[PDB]
Design a binder for this molecule. Structure first.
Ligand SMILES: [Mg+2]
Ligand SMILES: [Mg+2]
Ligand SMILES: [Mg+2]
Ligand SMILES: [Mg+2]
Lengths: 136, 76, 76, 121, 82
RNA sequence: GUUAAGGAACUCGGCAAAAUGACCCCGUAACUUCGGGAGAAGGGGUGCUCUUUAGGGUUAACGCCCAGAAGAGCCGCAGUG
RNA sequence: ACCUAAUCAGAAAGCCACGGCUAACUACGUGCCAGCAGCCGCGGUAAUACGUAGGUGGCAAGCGUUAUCCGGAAUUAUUGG
RNA sequence: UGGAGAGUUUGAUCCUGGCUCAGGAUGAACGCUGGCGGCGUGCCUAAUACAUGCAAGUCGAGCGACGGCGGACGGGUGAGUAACACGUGGAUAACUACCUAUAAGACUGGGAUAACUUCGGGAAACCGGAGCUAAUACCGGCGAAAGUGAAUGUCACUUAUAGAUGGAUCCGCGCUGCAUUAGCUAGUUGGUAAGGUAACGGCUUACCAAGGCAACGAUGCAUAGCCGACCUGAGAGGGUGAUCGGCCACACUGGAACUGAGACACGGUCCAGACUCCUACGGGAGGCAGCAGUAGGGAAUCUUCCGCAAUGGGCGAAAGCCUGACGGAGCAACGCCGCGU
């Protein structure tokens, strides 16, 4: 507004918040690295084999994996692709991005470098799922 | 380890100045007692030796050379 | 005082110099005082000697120690 | 002369401080002990940042005392503080260091580690 | 000493011996909004024999340090009014 | 009246005893009806001799009583001994 | 570093997409299922919007995905409400 | 010189208005595939204990059979500090192993002792004793003074100069978030006193004196090395602090010193604390945020490489000598560039 008021208080701009909460900050030090920052990726360790549904009008079935992350906290997940060589308490790489119409799930289990290593059943969409073909 | 031999000078160079310094100051601490009596016998001809040890702020350079005038600036 | 110095620059497999002068307390790479001009080491598609003795005589008055391979510039 | 409910310092870095006494191990009806006997302590005070927490039944050995022992030559010894060392299930101390002069009596071939850690004995 | 900077300003209060405070005016420009704005640091000043009173316009020279903020040195009396 | 090591293990129950106690200082929480809490708690100092100076009243004044400060020094296990 | 002379075009190319945006389409299998999704969402009996071969488009010794930051956002706007 | 848009609330509109996508980035990770000439950058997460190697010496024209200059430059790191730490312009109350320009004078007179053989104790760190000796070592008269050697020349000593060089210091301005934090320090603010360091100084102490700061942000909390620059942008601005240069602080932790020209000293030092490990359990040793490599939390960052030829630095009058500064190589599509199949 008035140039008198703008001297007396500047434009304190709009804060934003992260779309994906449970990563990427200095958390809660407890004389060791009790919890840390994972900007793109991490390890995991699993806790539960997941089976769930979307909720809005949709009626399909989905297979998450409710884990405890490497910084004491609890998140859901998802395995893209077909195969599932995963059981309880097995290491899984992470990468962010929510899943719409599921009520509370958080990230994608990377199908390349983990115990989630390689998914067969795919032949054209490949590097999104970690499937090889050394002929070409 | 060629600073081993530098240590052997360091316990050896403490003796020469701290003898000179403690003789510099008690010749000067008795001097302002002798300058409190002023009979020209216990103050004369050793005050310039109290200034010779304040000239041995240039000879005994442990007391710094530019710091020669930190005490001797009043009596003479 | 000061010492006449060649700041080495230049990429991989190709040095190049700039004639500067500062005290030995200052390092090679930087905190350099003045520059009397460039110097050209390689001679293929490039000159071989470069100096400007106008502001070089300003430093041989208050003292200067040229390195004995830099003095072959100013002997020519 | 230790008793059935006296307190003792602990002279090591095992994560403890002043411990009580519960019972003196040995024969029945036993009422005192001295340098080099086991007891049953309980931790009444602890350093935050240790491996023994407060309120926990542990054993010990009496290492110093204000009473002392009498030796073969008739020599006596008297400390000025009571102290003990928390000992594990087999004979060896739980901590790492020991902050005091242990008694010269203490080993018989048996506590061959507590006398191997004291500043002097 | 002999040639130092000058901050002419009003004398606020003589409250102890050899000590006053000589306030000055400074309108400072803002960074981007353009409209100027006032800031008035109130610097203390040694004066020789309680020569100042409340309200004088003076002339100030600097010196070599004395104590906590007694860093300026009064010179003149341009105005001797109240 | 005193007591080695331990200190409520005594016992219906810390019952009786033991410790705390004066003046001068620093400092003091929750809570509240704003007065209180509060001597809250937890802390320090005190003896004798010698040198200087600032304090009332009495009185013309030497004289007399009332006092508080720093500094220097001495002795004992312990200075409201 | 450079450079000549040799049997040899012979060793030396991927990767994501292809409703609308947004650059690029067809035939079946499953067929509100294994899924997919940046939002509109395409899936109840194939479905140009899911895996598959064909086809094309993009970039190219590199192609996509993530988390983070600025522009898009005139959506903190003095220039600009 | 240069500045785009699309989608979605309704049966259908105009508007306000959010959320969402296309693009540029990464000292990124991870997903598939793999030809490189050539150029760069590769601890950003547990400040998690650091094997084995090399990084500070030099001088046999000191002098004997330690006396000098250098280890205050240089090369690593961001836990600290919201501050003259830094940036930017003003000021003098004073500080040089050096470097140099002229000139002075470089005299006189003495005596103590390491290495070395005996002496005894310790497993050791090594020490107490005794005969032996020079020194350019040591001593006296606003006052100290040096001599040395291949052809006297040369080269350091010493005093007063002033120039460069180098550090110190108060001052104007620039320096993050919060007011759901309003009071704040007491030697605090000031004179005076003598002491105190290169100098000014409440710089540390002593009697008097009643002030400092503040709604123009004083005080207290959590987050942070900072600039030149990097990123994006039409620009104005927003976000960042890495290699690369200038300045700053720190050395497993917390104090304090000593020698010298101007260290509170990374590789020295006495002490105190938590840790490793050996000894005869009487004692002593150890500090890779030097150059790499291993261990460790990790989704994540490399060779235990010969070597001083060039440029730069100590020492010497010179040959040269030590140089993990550096001149370069060993490894990853890590980034741009150029280039083929
Ligand atoms: Mg009470
Ligand atoms: Mg109460
Ligand atoms: Mg080094
Ligand atoms: Mg290097």
């Amino acid at each position: 507004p008035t140039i008198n008021q703008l001297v007396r208080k500047p434009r304190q701009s709009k804060i934003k918040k992260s779309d994906s909460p449970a990563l990427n900050k200095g958390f809660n030090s407890k004389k060791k690295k009790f919890t840390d920052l994972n900007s793109p990726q991490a390890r995991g360790v699993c806790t539960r084999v997941g089976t769930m549904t979307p909720k809005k009008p949709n009626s399909a079935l989905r297979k998450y994996a409710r884990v405890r992350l490497s910084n004491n906290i609890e998140i859901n997940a998802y395995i893209p692709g077909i195969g599932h060589n995963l059981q309880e308490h097995s290491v899984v790489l992470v990468r962010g991005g929510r899943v719409k119409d599921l009520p509370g799930v958080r990230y994608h289990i990377v199908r390349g470098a983990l115990d989630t290593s390689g998914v067969d059943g795919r032949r054209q969409g490949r590097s999104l799922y970690g499937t090889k073909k050394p002929k070409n | 380890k060629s600073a081993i031999k530098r240590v052997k000078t360091t316990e050896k160079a403490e003796a020469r100045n701290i003898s000179q310094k403690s003789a510099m100051r008690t010749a000067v601490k008795n001097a302002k007692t002798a300058v409190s009596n002023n009979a020209d016998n216990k103050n004369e001809l050793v005050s310039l030796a109290v200034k010779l040890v304040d000239k041995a702020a240039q000879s005994n350079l442990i007391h710094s050379n530019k710091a020669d005038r930190i005490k001797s600036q009043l009596m003479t | 005082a000061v010492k006449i110095r060649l700041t080495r620059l230049g990429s991989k497999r190709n040095p190049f110099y700039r004639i500067v002068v500062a005290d030995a307390r200052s390092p090679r790479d930087g905190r350099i005082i003045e520059q009397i001009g460039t110097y050209n080491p390689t001679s293929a598609n490039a000159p071989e000697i470069k100096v400007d003795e106008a502001l070089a005589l300003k430093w041989l008055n208050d003292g200067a120690k040229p390195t004995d391979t830099v003095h072959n510039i100013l002997s020519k | 002369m230790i008793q059935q409910e006296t307190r003792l310092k602990v002279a090591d870095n095992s994560g403890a401080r002043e411990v009580l006494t519960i019972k003196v191990l040995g024969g029945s009806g036993r009422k005192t002990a001295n340098i080099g006997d086991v007891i049953v302590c309980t931790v009444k005070n602890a350093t935050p940042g240790g491996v023994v927490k407060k309120g926990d039944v542990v054993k010990a050995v009496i290492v110093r005392t204000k009473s002392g022992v009498r030796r073969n030559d008739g020599s006596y010894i008297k400390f000025d503080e009571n102290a003990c060392v928390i000992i594990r299930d087999d004979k060896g101390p739980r901590g790492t260091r020991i902050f005091g002069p242990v008694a010269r009596e203490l080993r018989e071939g048996n506590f061959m580690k507590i006398v191997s850690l004291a500043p002097e004995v | 000493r002999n040639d130092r900077k000058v901050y002419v300003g009003k004398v606020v209060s003589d409250k102890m011996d050899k000590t006053i405070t000589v306030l000055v005016e400074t309108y400072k420009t803002h960074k981007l909004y353009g409209k100027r704005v006032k800031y008035s640091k109130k610097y203390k000043t040694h004066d020789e024999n309680n020569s100042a009173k409340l309200g004088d316009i003076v002339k100030i020279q600097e010196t070599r340090p004395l104590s906590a903020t007694k860093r300026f040195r009064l010179v003149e009396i341009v105005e001797e009014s109240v």
